[model samples]
Target: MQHPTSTDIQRVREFLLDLQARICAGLEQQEKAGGGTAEFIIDDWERPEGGGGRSRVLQNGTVIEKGGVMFSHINISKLPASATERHPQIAGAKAQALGVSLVIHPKNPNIPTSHANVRLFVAEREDQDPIWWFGGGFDLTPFYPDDQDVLNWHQAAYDLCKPFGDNVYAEHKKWCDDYFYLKHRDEQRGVGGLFFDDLNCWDFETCFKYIQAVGNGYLNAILPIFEKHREQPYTEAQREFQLYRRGRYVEYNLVYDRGTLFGLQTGGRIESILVSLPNLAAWSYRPEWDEDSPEKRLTDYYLKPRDWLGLE
Candidate 1:
């Protein structure tokens, strides 16, 4: 197995930092376009063990209710079990990780709450080559489903994977569905996009290029959907549903999300780790939906795993 050089690690770190900056800028531009005065408040923090990160958050904007985009590079004495599950060979190895993760909660229920992350992990072994891999994906969660918006979201994912290989989208799409599932509820978090991990099957350059595609492709996929629905008027009832559905988002991130678990297990910054959650979420006692309502359609139709592009 090939180990990552200092140059390789540096390149990944640079890309993640740049990706974070661009996403923050893009979101700020969107906020300006919507006549919202909000901008991301930048916070730079450090870990005593090794490295540090920058966190940018925008809140109470005309477009976005709450959003956070964060970049971090940290070294750990040993790899967390959450990160080593798929690569037991790297268990307990000294490690360094670099990642950019972001989540946006739009004010209008019509616009979907979106999330995307890209990361690189390197595990150093004693007298053996280092183990390294890349992982990340972008997914959408809409309170009120829009067919065109969902189609365009999947189309962007398909386009990003087309240059990689025929099976890239298929494999990652299924992975997203599987990874984002809420097993306890027997439900999906949202309409899936792409999720991949242990992704060092290709050369370093190839893997890096794929990670770049995912990072950039996510902004391209979600921004237009936000623009389309940002101005739409929403009722209090619709907003209520959005908050209620966000309860599932919280459940997945706290319980099922490997990234969250990894960060918590490794003693990462608590605020940064939990920033993926929405500003508000709720759970009511056995809420009911009308059979023919959009709320019902969201559960019955949009959440299922299928060929979104094939439906055309």
Candidate 2:
């Protein structure tokens, strides 16, 4: 099931787009179901030597800012040397359809923003068929942590991961913490969630489906919490807290986020990659705060582990 060319790429593009569109619409409607404005821009690009793909970006929703579902099918012919500087593993991989990704960052701090991607990768096996890998995961980052909410969130994922028998929860949890981490400050973006790349053990067909299963199960359990908090009228202090947290977020993306690094190295669209950042986040004077401080207590829920999985 290695996606071979533009044709397959088109199918995946449509599939992911439709889902993303629906999800975006749901997010927008949750706040401004009818009154909000969702402005989008659709553009195309030409690789220096070969192919291109559509970049659909939507911003300024009642509940979302800077979200893009981009599908780019590129030929290996145009790959620049620097593209792999950060991704040394794929330094020489070459094939027909080279990239596919879906990146979304929601504006509402109550609901967690997410990233999910499926790609066609190639290297030594260009003669037989390029290897296929599923990349990305949807993780929750609540502005204020709720033990009950955290439990509900991880329970859904843990239940699914158990049958699969990999202790997936532990791995992904560390990933979310580390992947979204701010190295300069040496703290995580949020609690943590699942993240894996270059996944190749399962057959190609089974891989994406398994990833899809976890995604589906996660949404079912998690969306309800967001719906409950969507219009709770967060206090000014709460909003300010979220913004200060953004300081750590920016540090992680600029200093350590792999996706941001990879996109920068490959000359992938910058605006699209940087979409994870909030539209407006603030910095305050003497903003000294701690995990125990009331200003930072909202993050308290994440500092301690919650038993989300009923199995425990």
Q: lDDT for every model?
A: 0.88, 0.59
State, as a TM-score between 0 and 1, how close model 1 is to the true structure.
0.95
Off by over 4 Å in 1: 1-3, 82-85
lDDT for 108 (candidate 2) = 56
Top TM-score hit: 1
User: Which residue segments of model 2 deviate by more than 4 Å?
Assistant: 1-14, 39-41, 44-49, 76-93, 96-109, 112-120, 124-126, 160-163, 214-222, 290-294, 298-312
Over 170-233, each residue of candidate 2 has an lDDT whose tens digit, in order, gives 7766666556655555455664556666565666546655565654554466557657666656
Q: Deviation in angstroms for 294 in model 1?
A: 0.5
Worst 10 residues of 2 by lDDT: 298-307
Candidate 1, residues 1-312: lDDT per residue as tens digits?
554888889988988988888898888888888899999899999888889899999987888889999998988676556556778778767888899989999888999889998999888878878888999999999889999988888889999998889889999998999888899988889999999988989888899999999999998888888778778898999989999999989999999887688779767688988988999999999999999999999989988776788932
The TM-score that candidate 2 achieves is 0.77
